[PDB]
Design a protein around this ligand. Sequence first.
Ligand code: HEC
Ligand code: HEM
Ligand code: HEM
Lengths: 81, 66, 240, 51, 380, 55, 71, 99, 141, 59
Amino acid sequence: SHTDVKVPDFSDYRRAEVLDSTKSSKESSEARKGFSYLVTATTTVGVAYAAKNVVSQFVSSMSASADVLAMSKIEIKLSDI
Amino acid sequence: LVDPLTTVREHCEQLEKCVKARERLELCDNRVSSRSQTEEDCTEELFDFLHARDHCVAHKLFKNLK
Amino acid sequence: SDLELHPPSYPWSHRGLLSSLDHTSIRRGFQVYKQVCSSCHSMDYVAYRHLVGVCYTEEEAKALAEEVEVQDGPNDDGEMFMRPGKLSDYFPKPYPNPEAARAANNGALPPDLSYIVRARHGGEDYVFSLLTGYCEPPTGVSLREGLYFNPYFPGQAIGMAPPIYTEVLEYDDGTPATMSQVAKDVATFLRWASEPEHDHRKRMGLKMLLMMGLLLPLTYAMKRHKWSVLKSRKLAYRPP
Amino acid sequence: LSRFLGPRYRELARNWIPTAGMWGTVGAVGLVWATDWRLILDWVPYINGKF
Amino acid sequence: MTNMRKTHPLFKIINHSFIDLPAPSNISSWWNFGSLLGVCLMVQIITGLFLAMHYTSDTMTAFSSVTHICRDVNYGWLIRYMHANGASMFFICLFLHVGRGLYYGSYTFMETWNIGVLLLFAVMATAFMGYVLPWGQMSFWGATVITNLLSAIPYIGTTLVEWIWGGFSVDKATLTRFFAFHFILPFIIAALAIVHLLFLHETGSNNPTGLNSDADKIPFHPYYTIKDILGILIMFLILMTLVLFFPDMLGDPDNYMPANPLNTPPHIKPEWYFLFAYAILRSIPNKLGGVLALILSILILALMPFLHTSKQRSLMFRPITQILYWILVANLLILTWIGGQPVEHPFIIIGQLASISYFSIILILMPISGIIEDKMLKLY
Amino acid sequence: IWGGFSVDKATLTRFFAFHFILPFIIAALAIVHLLFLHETGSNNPTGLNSDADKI
Amino acid sequence: GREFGNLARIRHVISYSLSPFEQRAFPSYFSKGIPNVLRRTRERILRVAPPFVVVYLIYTWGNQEFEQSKR
Amino acid sequence: WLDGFRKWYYNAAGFNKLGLMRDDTLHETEDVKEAIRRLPEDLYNDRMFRIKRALDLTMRHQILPKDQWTKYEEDKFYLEPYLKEVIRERKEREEWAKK
Amino acid sequence: MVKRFFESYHEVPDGTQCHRKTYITTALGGICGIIGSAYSVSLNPADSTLEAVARVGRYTFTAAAIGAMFGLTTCVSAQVREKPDDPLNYFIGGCAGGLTLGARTHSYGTAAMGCVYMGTAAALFKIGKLEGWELFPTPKV
Amino acid sequence: PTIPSRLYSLLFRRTSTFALTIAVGALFFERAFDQGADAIYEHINEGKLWKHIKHKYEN
Ligand code: HEC
Ligand code: HEM
Ligand code: HEM
């Protein structure tokens, strides 16, 4: 027929707060979304720390070299004159 | 006037493989002393003796050798 | 004598994957390099600027720079005049030409000491064992005039003296100046002159290793979280 | 290959012999004119002298 | 009111190529290597941007400019060793991409494969032609050996090698020539990769199983961009392990002297992605046969569209064609070791036997292997 | 953008690298210039939607 | 692979899929993963393994035979 | 012995473990795609179900258990009376093109 | 010449020359499989000549694979440890030969028992060659 | 309610607050990772870096 089909058991795949069918959802959906979004935020803060690091390495590479910073600094006034 | 690191001499008087390399090296020394105007020499046996000597004083004597 | 000897894996202070060099031994190696090896060998790509931040203070590096009279140009009347060195100039070449270096060292060129450890296979263990390998030659091996035998140089004929022994320098840091200590000090100093980025390199490697250890299972969990729809996708087939 | 070998394809290849051979001489004469070969340009009497 | 990713035309081609491209769901980690080659080409381009800003191209101070980058330029050592080990990362991703292409039945994407081997020729040319540019003894003598082996052809050989040299040997015009070529070539490699993606997107991607994947399709976003990010993070793990821990391990230590034409290294050796090329060139005793074996060795995997005698597409359901493919990559590893070894009896007979067996696998034994697959599975 | 206290060697090599790389950015921008042109069509001197008379 | 709607003409096939947020991200990662890696390596280690030990035998043969011949 | 070697080759090919018979793992050429147009509808439907289930199984990198593997004696050669007709029609078309 | 061929195993020390070593123990496993399959044919007769030749080929191939995997893993452990006078280098090879035995007879418990028994047999063989008192002694008292 | 449930109910629901917490975590995490990794790098290398010798051998 048309309602012969039932969705099978996902009990070997379901997360630990949504195993029970006697309890309802929207009581641990905040936790089960906030865990994966904490993983999303900490993955994105790893990507953001790498992006704030490597672009700063490249910007300090476009900045002045140690030979030029050693050459341009020597305004030694002395005490001879 | 201080002494150098004599753990090369301590290794080669403590280990059997170093005096085996020493005895085959002096056998080749007597061979090239008996044979005059020869092309063979003691280079490969002194190479193996130096390799065993420096490998042991690198890998098992490290309390002063860096 | 076309065979070359591989140097043994010496247990250095920086041979480990996360251990930097001994900066005190870098200072000792620069001191005994300036004593005995800098009068013949010529390095060029290192300077007195690079010693500060690693082994010396700025006043100590200025006092090391001012003791050498290096050549600049030109004098205002139109000639060449001498000045004391500063931190900006590079190292004093003791031979002004490579052909003058070969004519002073009998036809043997002293190579560029700034890149020896990266330049040679085996690393600084070769540079330690070449200086500590000055043994007597075996019989059946005869050499030239003024030429001494090493087992570590390819070709088995160095163009050198036996340059270091016990009491080369009255050593200012209090360590005894034996030959293995002096050769270890110039080997880690030439490793520093070859790779001055060793401390920052393994520091950035530590940041990278802790960052990938705290980032890669999160990215793997994000791949599994965005792919767990397909991992839990079960099909069916119901024809009528 | 096996479908391309036949009497009709041999007759089509015979029909396409002179224009493809003339295009091959076009490519050869153009390669000679582009590279200026000293063996070949010294045989043409209009460029006989030194160029 | 309207969708921007199907209305705006740059966003339309970005959405069609990147967002909801119909891709098969069953592709493995070996399918990530094409986008890994794209981001590795982009990181080679951006490290070359930040590397050529302090690089002076002339033989008096090319090596002095390289040491000025590695010492006096702030974070210049990271850029130069990241560029060299990212060339190594680029070639190991290219070798795993072409191993996936030889494995998983994707010979038959014919124009994709032909513009791929044109791209592979350009990548190898720009890799050697940028390996000259540090101007060491090994780089100069490798330039002399590789360009001198192109002089084996009569009547065009010495004209070609003074054309590619600008003199009797490698000199200042040769180094500035190779630096201009090393600038211009990866951008035409990137445009060739863009039209390689266009020739892919004509007919979609393929599965590991060699089947028509039109029944089961997932969008590329967000199912494959997070696998792209995971592949990018593991590729950056191995690349940053290569730059920050073992910088000269995959490189040659003999390059780090100043270049001198008056002496020769005791064995002359090109880079690790050119070692099988140098072993195939060293296998043939005739020099013209060696350079013809070079060109035929790079070009002979473009004949693999024409060497598909089997009615099954992939090698997933071909068990002794898998045996011949793994003995092909074993021959490639033996070729890499033989090219790393110098020219001595008996490395030459091992290189000769391994090059003969590699050409017998890529030409003879694998089409008759596909014939005996379809004979053992009763197709005819 | 100077790389130092004045215009110098690093400024000249950096401007060499930028001057080499920027026409390929101009070529890719010309490709997307053609791509944004080819859906909206091309103008005429009369200034009309001229889809009836097209060659 | 032209577009995402006119590709196939399939019929009578039903696909159930759960959420990313209603299920575990690592569902039995060890007890169903290490038998799966063991089954995949059991399927392909007899095809990927003996060419590489031929490579290692040729490598040790070449190194010890070159060091024997260079005496 | 030849049937035992063919069954060992069927086990070593791997698509009996994965859920496909002999005629699903064909290269989709123009002859095979003409036969794809020329199957009946039920055979086409469970063939594309078997290809979709095989793509699901090689996405999950796992196979079915041994009780529901496609046996060599349970293999049917459904595409072969269509593919042989397409091959002989293409052969007579190329012979008429040679004529 | 068979015994002079088979005594090339011992005068070359472990850690070097793995190809000749695995050829000697592959030939030893093939000879022991030939005599074990001859005993299996003369104990249980096959129903066909094709079944008997498949039985002797299968037993010779499995015992040659046991000997080849034993000597290959013994020399691979000798390469990775560089200890030629070590019975653990024969323990790993005997366990790999027993695992090859149990993989060929398709039972993991038999693989574990073959690992334990063939590993202690190879360890007793290498340590009996190390001390030197013979398995087959001359009568001396 | 647990701590990711309160974090989603007050903090992770809005995407701008999500990016705000990502950037605030970057601002704290740069200094925290620099301090922790420099503490690890000078804990495993006592007496070898310049910071353990500049306090006593600078003059
Ligand atoms: C007489 C001047 C002189 C002195 C003093 C000297 N060297 Fe040398 N050195 C040379 C020459 C000349 C060569 C190369 C030719 C040869 O092999 O004889 C050389 C070779 C070397 C090499 C080998 C590089 C290679 O590529 O093989 C190293 C390393 C080296 N010296 C370091 C040192 C160190 C460290 C010292 C200080 C203990 C030192 N040298 C003392 C002149 C000198
Ligand atoms: C080095 C630059 C290269 C880049 C950037 C590149 C890029 C890509 C991309 C993006 C894909 C699609 C995979 C995906 O996104 O999931 C792909 C697939 C493909 N590429 Fe490349 N490719 C490169 C080199 C090559 C070469 C040299 C060849 C020829 C041997 C080649 C042949 C193929 C083939 C046949 C496919 C289709 C099969 C598959 O998806 O794996 N590619 N490439
Ligand atoms: C268009 C982008 C690129 C630019 C501008 C560029 C620029 C440079 C420059 C200036 C150098 C010399 C500095 C040095 O010694 O490392 C160099 C070296 C090199 N490049 Fe590139 N490059 C580019 C892309 C690539 C690519 C795609 C590859 C890989 C095939 C590559 C491989 C190399 C190699 C192997 C070296 C030598 C590294 C060494 O020995 O130091 N480059 N490149």
